A paper describes a structure:
Human NAD-dependent isocitrate dehydrogenase or [name] (HsIDH3) catalyzes the decarboxylation of isocitrate into α-ketoglutarate in the tricarboxylic acid cycle. It consists of three types of subunits (α, β, and γ) and exists and functions as the (αβαγ)2 heterooctamer. In this work, we report the crystal structures of the αβ and αγ heterodimers and the (αβαγ)2 heterooctamer containing an α-Q139A mutation in the clasp domain, which renders all the heterodimers and the heterooctamer constitutively active in the absence of activators.
Crystals of αMICT+Ca+NADβNAD belong to space group C2221 and there are two αMβ heterodimers in an asymmetry unit, which form an (αMβ)2 heterotetramer through a noncrystallographic 2-fold axis. In this structure, there are an [name], NAD, and Ca2+ bound at the active site of the α subunit, which are clearly defined in the electron density map; in addition, there is an NAD bound at the pseudo-allosteric site of the β subunit, and the ADP-ribose moiety of NAD is well defined in the electron density map albeit the nicotinamide moiety is poor defined. In the αMICT+Ca+NADβNAD structure, the active site is bound with the substrate [name], the cofactor NAD, and a Ca2+ ion. This is the first pseudo-Michaelis complex reported for HsIDH3 and other NAD-IDHs. The binding of NAD to the active site induces the α large domain and in particular, the β3A-α3A and β12A-α8A loops to rotate toward the α-β interface, resulting in a closed conformation of the active site. In addition, the sidechain of Asp230A is in close proximity to the hydroxyl group of Tyr126A (2.8 Å) and the ε-ammonium group of Lys184B (2.9 Å). Thus, the Lys184B-Asp230A-Tyr126A triad appears to be in favorable geometries for proton transfer. Specifically, the α-carboxyl group interacts with Arg88A, Arg98A, and Arg119A; the β-carboxyl group interacts with Arg88A and Arg119A; the γ-carboxyl group interacts with Thr74A, Ser82A, Asn84A; and the α-hydroxyl group forms hydrogen bonds with Lys184B, Asp217B, and Asp230A, and a coordination bond with the Ca2+ ion.
Numbering used by the authors:
A (entry chain B): 14 to 82, 91 to 352
B (entry chain A): 3 to 47, 49 to 337
Amino acid sequence: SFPVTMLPGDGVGPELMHAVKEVFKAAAVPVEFQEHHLSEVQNMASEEKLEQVLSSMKENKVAIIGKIHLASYDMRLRRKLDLFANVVHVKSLPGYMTRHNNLDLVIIREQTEGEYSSLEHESARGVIECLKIVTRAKSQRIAKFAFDYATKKGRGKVTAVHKANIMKLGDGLFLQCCEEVAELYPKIKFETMIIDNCCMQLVQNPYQFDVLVMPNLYGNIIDNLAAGLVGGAGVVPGESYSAEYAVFETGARHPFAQAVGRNIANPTAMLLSASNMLRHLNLEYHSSMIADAVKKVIKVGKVRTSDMGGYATCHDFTEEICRRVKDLDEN
Amino acid sequence: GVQTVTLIPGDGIGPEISAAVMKIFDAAKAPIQWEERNVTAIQGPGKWMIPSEAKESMDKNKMGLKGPLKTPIAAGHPSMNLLLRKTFDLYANVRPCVSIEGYKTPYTDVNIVTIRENTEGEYSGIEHVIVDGVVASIKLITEGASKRIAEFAFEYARNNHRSNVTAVHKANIMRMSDGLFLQKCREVAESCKDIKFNEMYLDTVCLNMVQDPSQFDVLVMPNLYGDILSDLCAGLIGGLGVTPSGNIGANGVAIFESVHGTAPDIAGKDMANPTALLLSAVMMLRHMGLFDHAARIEAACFATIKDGKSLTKDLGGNAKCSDFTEEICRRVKD
Ligand SMILES: NC(=O)c1ccc[n+]([C@@H]2O[C@H](COP(=O)([O-])OP(=O)(O)OC[C@H]3O[C@@H](n4cnc5c(N)ncnc54)[C@H](O)[C@@H]3O)[C@@H](O)[C@H]2O)c1
Ligand SMILES: NC(=O)c1ccc[n+]([C@@H]2O[C@H](COP(=O)([O-])OP(=O)(O)OC[C@H]3O[C@@H](n4cnc5c(N)ncnc54)[C@H](O)[C@@H]3O)[C@@H](O)[C@H]2O)c1
Ligand SMILES: [Ca+2]
């Protein structure tokens, strides 16, 4: 019934998407995936595949995607779809024990400027400049998003992470636009932390954080730091947004190319954001069901992939959920 | 013989922690004389500079011990830490991260050395307002600096019998600059096959470091990455109150400092942890070949920590910084 754009992506991307399709079938989820292949496609054919994804999104409004790769294909995609805001929900899984259990964090990263625009040159032989872009426009949007997230989801603190002491013009602009819109949301507590400090805080005591907003590169750092705290990739989901579109990804994006054709990859992250997707499509029964089937299979601990201390293969772990899921629908 | 070290006490909590380490040095009867000057003042001559008296003390003594200097957020004067490192070509920042025996954290037997290029990277002072509302900060990576820090880290690994060096980079995202950093480490790696070499993207390092620190040894990065990863791993072993550092240049010129900044929220009180600046003065003694004073000063603070009884606030304690320091000095002397 519901058309969803699908870009399987790199490495385990396709094997992950496959587990989503299998779990959906078992749950009888009324979604029909329109698959599109964008990863490492020839450079001359790039912009046409880029456009039909743009136009596929114009029909479907929603997508689920793997990892991708004169700017990078990822940036072009983010730009054509204007996916300015990235959110990654760092949440402990009740049976899956780490050094930071009971953790509930949200990381909001803007992902259309900064170090990611490929603006480099050689100014002398051996001397290379690399330009990191910060704009009022984009930093304004992402701070409003963070504060709308905090309001929409009943959160209470939004912390802006910067390095404005030494990059006073660039990170300064980002930081004061967050200061500006932080007054438009007086019911939300606003704080600020220099980024190195905050990564120290994230390891030593991440329970004081709630919601975090930052530019692109720091979001990459902290997306991955925080995912590590609750059991790593394989487990943490993320989604990214425009004004129209919602696209669902894994939280700490990595291709896991060493795992391709082995049966070892964890579909927990992709299955979870698939359930996050189904909520965005107003399929709350299907999303709630798939999600806490995944959480129960993990909690009982009979079947677990190798990154979660078990020995089960990807397929065995995927079939374990489908059996659980297909049974829930009966009971 | 007695040797003179330049002492920059610094802003915020820096004056109290220096006093501490000085006091522990007199207790240990170290052959050290302190020449105190204040880099805290930043002076505009276009150029920004270190006050003349600090510059001469360093150029005379060429050993420094320094507390944190405050750098305004988004507003005032540039990092005078950056300025110190560039005017003395302190190109290598050495940030070992080692688990403290008597203090339990969720991670055990952490032995990390972050080696961070100190002069360039995203910590150049270079930004430009392109148009209204459009800012461009400029990162700089050069052949010569990248080759030199890579040689340093392979050489450090030999001096301290470490077996692997990891080039940490983001050359997928920043292909030219990190590419040049990584290609230059590959070159020095190929000239020192006695040392096992590998490279890892920065996100992956942080994704793994917090899960299994067992897997890393010596780390080399350009400036901005090393700044962040060294705070990340301070989280592992006890926090910013125990983590030492040293800014190394050519010809045995060096300024030792802790990894932490000013700590403006605990400044006036007596809550600070001095082991960070202490352990870096311990690095400083060993740099100077004063091994047997370094051994005792170290042994005392560790013994003081493995006991309990007097640990400062940040390490699960009630003890004032003064009270904490006195137990280290008490333990030295015996
Ligand atoms: N193929 C080559 O010749 C070559 C050369 C240079 C670089 N690279 C790239 O470097 C990459 C490796 O670097 P990286 O930093 O991106 O590491 P990565 O892709 O392997 O991911 C980092 C770690 O995150 C974990 N992880 C990610 N997805 C997971 C999942 N579904 N389930 C369980 N665990 C998961 C894994 O532990 C993984 O090792 C390669 O995958 C490759 O694309 C490749
Ligand atoms: N010169 C340097 O080496 C250096 C390093 C970092 C920051 N700074 C500067 O100082 C200021 C620091 O800002 P920040 O908040 O990120 O600094 P910070 O490193 O002090 O981080 C703040 C918190 O870290 C903890 N902490 C740090 N040192 C501690 C200690 N000795 N004992 C107990 N707790 C400690 C406390 O939570 C402290 O309040 C900035 O102006 C910044 O420019 C200087
Ligand atoms: Ca730091």
